[PDB]
Amino acid sequence: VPRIKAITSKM
Amino acid sequence: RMPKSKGATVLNLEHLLEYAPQQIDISNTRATQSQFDTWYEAVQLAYDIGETEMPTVMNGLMVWCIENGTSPNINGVWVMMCGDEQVEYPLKPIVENAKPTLRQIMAHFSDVAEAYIEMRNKKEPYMPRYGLVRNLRDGSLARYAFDFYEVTSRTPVRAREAHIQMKAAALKSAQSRLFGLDGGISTQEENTERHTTEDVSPSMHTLLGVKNM
Amino acid sequence: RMPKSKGATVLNLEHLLEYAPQQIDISNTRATQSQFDTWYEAVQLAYDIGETEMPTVMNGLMVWCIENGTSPNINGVWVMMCGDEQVEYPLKPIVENAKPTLRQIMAHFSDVAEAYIEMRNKKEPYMPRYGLVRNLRDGSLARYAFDFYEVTSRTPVRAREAHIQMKAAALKSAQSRLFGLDGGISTQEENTERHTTEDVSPSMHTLLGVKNM
Amino acid sequence: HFSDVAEAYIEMRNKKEPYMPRYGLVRNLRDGSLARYAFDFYEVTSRTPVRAR
Amino acid sequence: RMPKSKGATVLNLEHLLEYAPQQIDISNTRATQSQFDTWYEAVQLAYDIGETE
RNA sequence: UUUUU
RNA sequence: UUUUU
RNA sequence: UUUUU
RNA sequence: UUUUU
RNA sequence: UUUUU
């Protein structure tokens, strides 16, 4: 499963 | 006798005789379908995961919530076991988008959670950590030993008693407070008084009534 | 019934049927593998010990923690028994790098600790000092009498009861405080007023309104 | 305007080491899981947890 | 199961199986041997008494 | 851990 | 931030 | 979850 | 609203 | 209804 970035562009 | 207003029954007898909703669909202990869709969409958006890999993450989250509960105060990350590796997912999107509560959202997973616990117990001793904290001494009741389990008309009477006792033991005598500390901090009044070089002191303009002797 | 959003089940049935993680791997009462690796690397770095002699130090630390607990307030040094000699290791790297807590980090050592206690009891009476403080009167329960023991689905019911009673006795009615004394010390306002040789006193510029009679 | 990024950065730094902002050290905040809100320009929103608020 | 970091057990099984310290030697309710020696030497020095008396 | 005179 | 002798 | 020295 | 160094 | 980590 993919890993979630800490600080993404969605925020 | 039917309820009547202004000489007319206020109920539709035919529709009512044909009205057979599922009990879990009209209970207020479970989040509505609209609220569940909102939560699911918000979690998809926050995780940046496509609609095909999302159910796997949902499976992992359901198992993690079986183990560790669905309290509003849970924070940090939850974990999925990808083979022998551990993948960490932030819990903030899961909790901040669950309305009215995370327990009501996860109540939609209750039947699947019970089935999963039974399946895991078919191959090894599998009591959810919630049931270990509650000190439940019966292994055949492991399928109901999670905090988001939804009691239905098909729940066995013994299981219902065990679940209610576990809920009472877990909640204890916790009393809800409607308010925290008020965010208005300033209690004094702003000092609007001038200050000139003619003032005898920073706090007194003059000493008018003062007599030297 | 499965949880559905927008006319589509939100769970992957095949993966879920094949999803069988270990219970201790997904519990939040144990530090994650990443946190454990971070703690282990930080302790290696602080001790300046190679990767070959590090497991021996880990053995010594595990035995010491079985004896003396894993409280956040432990300080000073811990000791290893190199034959008849005593080697002292600082406890600061062990405690300051353990996240979220030292107990969660040492929970990874729980099965080995239980096995070690059983092995030591095979040759002599060996009750961990934690179980002596708790006044546990059963010697056959010595294998669970340490404060970082992790309760699992394989823990015997009697052992689970004893461990929960020991935890309740040790914690008593301790209440957590979120804050200490605030570090902002100054409460007064800075005195910005000038002071010239024309001032009648160090605190008064003049005596303007004063009348002698 | 930087509050969400600051919170995310504090969480990211805490993923690798103990990272409490000096503001939270001056305030003597004894909870490390609340480090992500322990700065003086943090903006409280409707998504802020009640305990964090 | 043993505690593992980066795909490697962090414990030495052979040494641990051979590690049998005395319980009173590793407890923190008793002063360490170094502290005891320091106290004994300080008391000898203060009392001006030989190692035989 | 300490605090047992 | 400073002010801890 | 924490708080068990 | 401000005043959180 | 909530409050079960």
Side-chain angles (χ1 to χ4, degrees), chain B residues 5-56:
Chain B
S5 156
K6 305 304 181 182
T9 87
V10 309
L11 298 173
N12 194 348
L13 189 53
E14 305 89 88
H15 161 265
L16 177 80
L17 279 160
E18 305 309 317
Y19 188 52
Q22 261 177 297
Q23 248 165 343
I24 62 161
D25 275 326
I26 55 170
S27 76
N28 67 341
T29 49
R30 159 198 283 243
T32 68
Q33 190 52 61
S34 174
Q35 285 166 319
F36 188 80
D37 304 352
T38 307
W39 170 82
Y40 186 86
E41 275 132 35
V43 175
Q44 270 216 87
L45 203 90
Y47 278 2
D48 200 42
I49 296 286
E51 70 176 347
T52 53
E53 298 298 349
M54 189 60 186
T56 310

Coordinates of all heavy atoms in Angstrom, one line a residue, chain B residues 5-56:
Chain B
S5 N -56.5 14.1 13.2 CA -56.4 15.5 13.3 C -57.5 16.1 12.4 O -57.4 15.8 11.2 CB -55.0 16.1 13.0 OG -55.1 17.4 12.6
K6 N -58.4 16.9 12.9 CA -59.4 17.6 12.2 C -60.3 16.6 11.4 O -60.6 16.7 10.2 CB -58.9 18.6 11.2 CG -58.0 19.7 11.9 CD -58.8 20.4 13.0 CE -57.9 21.5 13.6 NZ -58.6 22.1 14.7
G7 N -60.6 15.5 12.1 CA -61.4 14.4 11.5 C -60.8 13.7 10.3 O -61.5 13.5 9.3
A8 N -59.5 13.4 10.5 CA -58.8 12.6 9.4 C -57.6 12.0 10.0 O -56.8 12.6 10.7 CB -58.4 13.6 8.3
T9 N -57.5 10.7 9.8 CA -56.3 9.9 10.3 C -55.0 10.5 9.7 O -54.9 10.8 8.5 CB -56.4 8.5 9.9 OG1 -55.9 8.2 8.6 CG2 -57.9 8.0 9.9
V10 N -54.0 10.6 10.5 CA -52.7 11.2 10.2 C -51.7 10.2 9.7 O -50.6 10.5 9.5 CB -52.2 12.1 11.3 CG1 -53.2 13.1 11.8 CG2 -51.7 11.2 12.4
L11 N -52.1 8.9 9.5 CA -51.3 7.9 9.1 C -51.8 7.2 7.8 O -53.0 7.2 7.6 CB -51.1 6.8 10.2 CG -50.5 7.2 11.5 CD1 -50.6 6.1 12.5 CD2 -49.1 7.7 11.3
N12 N -50.8 6.8 7.0 CA -51.2 6.1 5.7 C -51.1 4.6 6.0 O -50.0 4.0 6.1 CB -50.2 6.5 4.6 CG -50.7 6.1 3.2 OD1 -51.6 5.3 3.1 ND2 -50.0 6.6 2.2
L13 N -52.2 3.9 6.1 CA -52.3 2.6 6.6 C -51.6 1.6 5.6 O -50.9 0.7 6.0 CB -53.7 2.1 6.8 CG -53.9 0.8 7.5 CD1 -53.1 0.7 8.7 CD2 -55.4 0.5 7.7
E14 N -51.8 1.8 4.3 CA -51.2 0.9 3.2 C -49.7 1.0 3.2 O -49.0 0.0 3.3 CB -51.8 1.3 1.9 CG -53.3 1.3 1.8 CD -54.0 2.6 2.1 OE1 -54.1 3.4 1.2 OE2 -54.3 2.8 3.3
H15 N -49.2 2.3 3.2 CA -47.7 2.4 3.2 C -47.1 1.9 4.4 O -46.1 1.2 4.4 CB -47.4 3.9 3.0 CG -46.0 4.2 3.4 ND1 -45.7 4.7 4.7 CD2 -44.8 4.1 2.7 CE1 -44.4 4.9 4.7 NE2 -43.8 4.6 3.6
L16 N -47.8 2.2 5.6 CA -47.2 1.7 6.9 C -47.2 0.1 6.9 O -46.2 -0.5 7.3 CB -48.1 2.2 8.0 CG -47.7 1.7 9.4 CD1 -46.5 2.4 9.9 CD2 -48.9 1.8 10.4
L17 N -48.3 -0.5 6.4 CA -48.3 -2.0 6.3 C -47.2 -2.4 5.3 O -46.7 -3.6 5.5 CB -49.6 -2.5 5.8 CG -50.7 -2.6 6.9 CD1 -52.1 -2.6 6.3 CD2 -50.5 -3.8 7.8
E18 N -46.8 -1.6 4.3 CA -45.7 -2.0 3.4 C -44.4 -1.4 3.9 O -43.4 -1.6 3.2 CB -46.0 -1.5 2.0 CG -47.4 -2.1 1.5 CD -47.5 -3.6 1.7 OE1 -46.5 -4.3 1.4 OE2 -48.6 -4.0 2.0
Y19 N -44.3 -0.6 5.0 CA -43.1 0.0 5.4 C -42.3 -0.9 6.3 O -42.7 -1.1 7.5 CB -43.4 1.3 6.1 CG -42.2 2.2 6.4 CD1 -41.3 2.5 5.4 CD2 -42.0 2.7 7.7 CE1 -40.2 3.3 5.7 CE2 -40.9 3.5 8.0 CZ -40.0 3.8 7.0 OH -38.9 4.5 7.3
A20 N -41.2 -1.5 5.9 CA -40.4 -2.4 6.6 C -38.9 -2.0 6.5 O -38.1 -2.7 5.9 CB -40.6 -3.8 6.2
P21 N -38.5 -0.9 7.1 CA -37.1 -0.5 7.1 C -36.2 -1.4 7.9 O -36.7 -2.0 8.9 CB -37.1 0.9 7.6 CG -38.3 1.0 8.5 CD -39.3 0.1 7.9
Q22 N -35.0 -1.5 7.6 CA -34.0 -2.2 8.5 C -33.8 -1.4 9.7 O -33.7 -0.2 9.7 CB -32.7 -2.4 7.7 CG -32.5 -3.8 7.2 CD -31.3 -4.0 6.4 OE1 -31.0 -3.4 5.4 NE2 -30.4 -4.9 6.9
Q23 N -33.7 -2.1 10.9 CA -33.6 -1.4 12.1 C -32.3 -0.6 12.3 O -32.4 0.5 12.8 CB -33.7 -2.4 13.3 CG -35.0 -2.2 14.1 CD -35.3 -3.4 15.0 OE1 -34.7 -4.5 14.8 NE2 -36.2 -3.3 15.9
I24 N -31.2 -1.1 11.7 CA -30.0 -0.4 11.8 C -30.0 0.8 10.9 O -29.1 1.7 11.1 CB -28.8 -1.3 11.5 CG1 -28.9 -1.8 10.1 CG2 -28.7 -2.4 12.5 CD1 -27.6 -2.4 9.5
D25 N -30.9 0.9 9.9 CA -30.9 2.0 9.0 C -31.6 3.2 9.6 O -31.5 4.3 9.0 CB -31.6 1.6 7.7 CG -30.7 0.9 6.7 OD1 -29.5 1.3 6.7 OD2 -31.1 0.0 6.0
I26 N -32.4 3.1 10.6 CA -33.2 4.2 11.2 C -32.8 4.5 12.6 O -33.5 5.3 13.3 CB -34.7 3.9 11.1 CG1 -35.0 2.6 11.7 CG2 -35.1 3.9 9.6 CD1 -36.5 2.3 11.8
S27 N -31.8 3.9 13.2 CA -31.3 4.1 14.5 C -30.4 5.4 14.5 O -29.7 5.6 13.5 CB -30.6 2.9 15.1 OG -29.3 2.8 14.5
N28 N -30.4 6.1 15.6 CA -29.6 7.3 15.8 C -28.3 7.0 16.5 O -27.6 7.9 16.8 CB -30.4 8.4 16.5 CG -30.7 8.0 17.9 OD1 -30.7 6.9 18.3 ND2 -31.0 9.1 18.7
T29 N -28.0 5.7 16.8 CA -26.7 5.3 17.4 C -25.7 5.0 16.3 O -24.6 4.6 16.5 CB -26.8 4.1 18.3 OG1 -27.6 3.1 17.6 CG2 -27.5 4.5 19.6
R30 N -26.1 5.2 15.0 CA -25.2 5.0 13.8 C -25.3 6.2 13.0 O -26.4 6.8 12.8 CB -25.7 3.7 13.1 CG -25.2 3.6 11.7 CD -26.1 2.6 10.9 NE -25.7 1.3 11.2 CZ -25.2 0.4 10.3 NH1 -25.0 0.8 9.0 NH2 -24.9 -0.8 10.7
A31 N -24.2 6.6 12.4 CA -24.1 7.7 11.5 C -25.0 7.5 10.3 O -25.1 6.4 9.8 CB -22.7 8.0 11.1
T32 N -25.6 8.6 9.8 CA -26.4 8.4 8.6 C -25.6 8.1 7.4 O -24.3 8.3 7.4 CB -27.2 9.7 8.3 OG1 -26.4 10.8 8.0 CG2 -28.0 10.1 9.6
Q33 N -26.2 7.7 6.3 CA -25.5 7.3 5.1 C -24.8 8.6 4.5 O -23.7 8.5 4.0 CB -26.4 6.7 4.1 CG -25.7 6.1 2.8 CD -24.6 5.2 3.2 OE1 -24.9 4.1 3.8 NE2 -23.4 5.5 2.8
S34 N -25.4 9.7 4.6 CA -24.8 11.0 4.1 C -23.6 11.3 4.9 O -22.5 11.7 4.3 CB -25.8 12.1 4.1 OG -25.2 13.3 3.8
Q35 N -23.6 11.2 6.2 CA -22.5 11.4 7.1 C -21.4 10.4 6.8 O -20.2 10.8 6.8 CB -22.9 11.4 8.5 CG -23.6 12.6 9.0 CD -24.3 12.4 10.4 OE1 -24.9 11.3 10.6 NE2 -24.3 13.4 11.2
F36 N -21.7 9.2 6.6 CA -20.7 8.2 6.2 C -20.0 8.5 4.9 O -18.8 8.3 4.8 CB -21.3 6.8 6.2 CG -20.3 5.7 6.1 CD1 -19.6 5.2 7.1 CD2 -20.1 5.1 4.8 CE1 -18.7 4.2 7.0 CE2 -19.2 4.1 4.7 CZ -18.5 3.6 5.8
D37 N -20.8 8.9 3.9 CA -20.2 9.2 2.6 C -19.3 10.5 2.7 O -18.3 10.5 2.1 CB -21.3 9.5 1.6 CG -22.3 8.3 1.4 OD1 -22.0 7.3 2.0 OD2 -23.3 8.5 0.7
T38 N -19.7 11.4 3.5 CA -18.9 12.6 3.8 C -17.6 12.2 4.4 O -16.5 12.7 4.0 CB -19.6 13.6 4.6 OG1 -20.9 13.9 4.0 CG2 -18.8 14.9 4.7
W39 N -17.6 11.4 5.4 CA -16.4 10.9 6.1 C -15.5 10.1 5.1 O -14.3 10.4 5.1 CB -16.8 10.1 7.3 CG -15.6 9.4 7.9 CD1 -14.7 9.9 8.8 CD2 -15.2 8.0 7.8 NE1 -13.7 9.0 9.2 CE2 -14.0 7.8 8.5 CE3 -15.7 7.0 7.0 CZ2 -13.4 6.6 8.6 CZ3 -15.0 5.8 7.0 CH2 -13.9 5.6 7.8
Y40 N -16.1 9.2 4.4 CA -15.3 8.4 3.4 C -14.6 9.3 2.4 O -13.5 9.1 2.1 CB -16.2 7.4 2.8 CG -15.5 6.4 1.9 CD1 -14.9 5.2 2.4 CD2 -15.5 6.5 0.5 CE1 -14.3 4.3 1.6 CE2 -14.9 5.6 -0.3 CZ -14.3 4.5 0.3 OH -13.7 3.6 -0.6
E41 N -15.4 10.3 1.8 CA -14.8 11.2 0.8 C -13.7 12.0 1.4 O -12.7 12.2 0.8 CB -15.9 12.0 0.2 CG -16.6 11.4 -0.9 CD -18.2 11.5 -0.8 OE1 -18.6 12.5 -0.3 OE2 -18.9 10.5 -1.2
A42 N -13.9 12.5 2.6 CA -12.9 13.3 3.3 C -11.6 12.5 3.5 O -10.5 13.0 3.3 CB -13.4 13.9 4.6
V43 N -11.8 11.3 4.0 CA -10.6 10.5 4.2 C -9.9 10.1 2.9 O -8.6 10.2 2.8 CB -11.0 9.2 5.0 CG1 -9.8 8.3 5.1 CG2 -11.5 9.5 6.4
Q44 N -10.6 9.9 1.8 CA -10.0 9.7 0.5 C -9.2 10.9 0.1 O -8.1 10.7 -0.5 CB -11.1 9.4 -0.5 CG -11.4 7.9 -0.7 CD -11.8 7.5 -2.1 OE1 -10.9 7.2 -2.9 NE2 -13.1 7.5 -2.4
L45 N -9.8 12.0 0.3 CA -9.2 13.3 -0.2 C -7.9 13.5 0.7 O -6.9 13.9 0.1 CB -10.1 14.4 0.0 CG -9.8 15.7 -0.8 CD1 -10.6 15.6 -2.2 CD2 -10.2 16.9 -0.1
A46 N -7.9 13.3 2.0 CA -6.8 13.5 2.8 C -5.7 12.5 2.5 O -4.5 12.9 2.6 CB -7.2 13.5 4.3
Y47 N -6.0 11.3 2.3 CA -5.0 10.2 2.1 C -4.4 10.2 0.7 O -3.4 9.6 0.4 CB -5.5 8.8 2.4 CG -5.5 8.5 3.9 CD1 -5.1 9.4 4.8 CD2 -6.0 7.3 4.3 CE1 -5.1 9.1 6.2 CE2 -6.0 6.9 5.7 CZ -5.5 7.9 6.6 OH -5.5 7.6 7.9
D48 N -5.1 10.9 -0.3 CA -4.6 11.0 -1.7 C -4.5 9.6 -2.2 O -3.6 9.2 -2.9 CB -3.3 11.7 -1.8 CG -3.1 12.2 -3.2 OD1 -4.0 12.7 -3.9 OD2 -1.9 12.1 -3.7
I49 N -5.6 8.8 -2.0 CA -5.6 7.4 -2.4 C -6.8 7.2 -3.4 O -7.9 7.7 -3.1 CB -5.8 6.4 -1.2 CG1 -4.5 6.5 -0.3 CG2 -6.0 5.0 -1.6 CD1 -3.3 5.8 -0.8
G50 N -6.5 6.4 -4.4 CA -7.6 6.2 -5.4 C -8.7 5.3 -4.9 O -8.6 4.7 -3.8
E51 N -9.8 5.2 -5.6 CA -11.0 4.5 -5.2 C -10.7 3.0 -5.3 O -11.6 2.2 -4.8 CB -12.1 4.9 -6.1 CG -12.0 4.4 -7.5 CD -13.3 4.7 -8.3 OE1 -14.3 5.1 -7.7 OE2 -13.2 4.6 -9.6
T52 N -9.6 2.5 -5.8 CA -9.4 1.1 -5.9 C -8.5 0.6 -4.8 O -8.8 -0.5 -4.3 CB -8.7 0.7 -7.2 OG1 -7.5 1.6 -7.4 CG2 -9.6 1.0 -8.4
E53 N -7.6 1.4 -4.3 CA -6.8 1.0 -3.1 C -7.4 1.4 -1.8 O -6.9 1.0 -0.7 CB -5.4 1.6 -3.2 CG -4.6 1.1 -4.4 CD -4.3 -0.4 -4.4 OE1 -4.6 -1.1 -3.4 OE2 -3.8 -0.9 -5.5
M54 N -8.5 2.2 -1.9 CA -9.1 2.7 -0.6 C -9.7 1.6 0.2 O -9.6 1.6 1.4 CB -10.2 3.8 -1.0 CG -10.8 4.5 0.2 SD -9.5 5.4 1.2 CE -10.5 5.9 2.5
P55 N -10.5 0.6 -0.4 CA -11.0 -0.5 0.5 C -10.0 -1.3 1.3 O -10.3 -1.7 2.4 CB -11.8 -1.4 -0.5 CG -12.2 -0.4 -1.6 CD -11.0 0.5 -1.7
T56 N -8.8 -1.4 0.8 CA -7.7 -2.1 1.5 C -7.4 -1.3 2.8 O -7.2 -1.9 3.9 CB -6.5 -2.3 0.6 OG1 -6.9 -2.9 -0.6 CG2 -5.5 -3.2 1.3

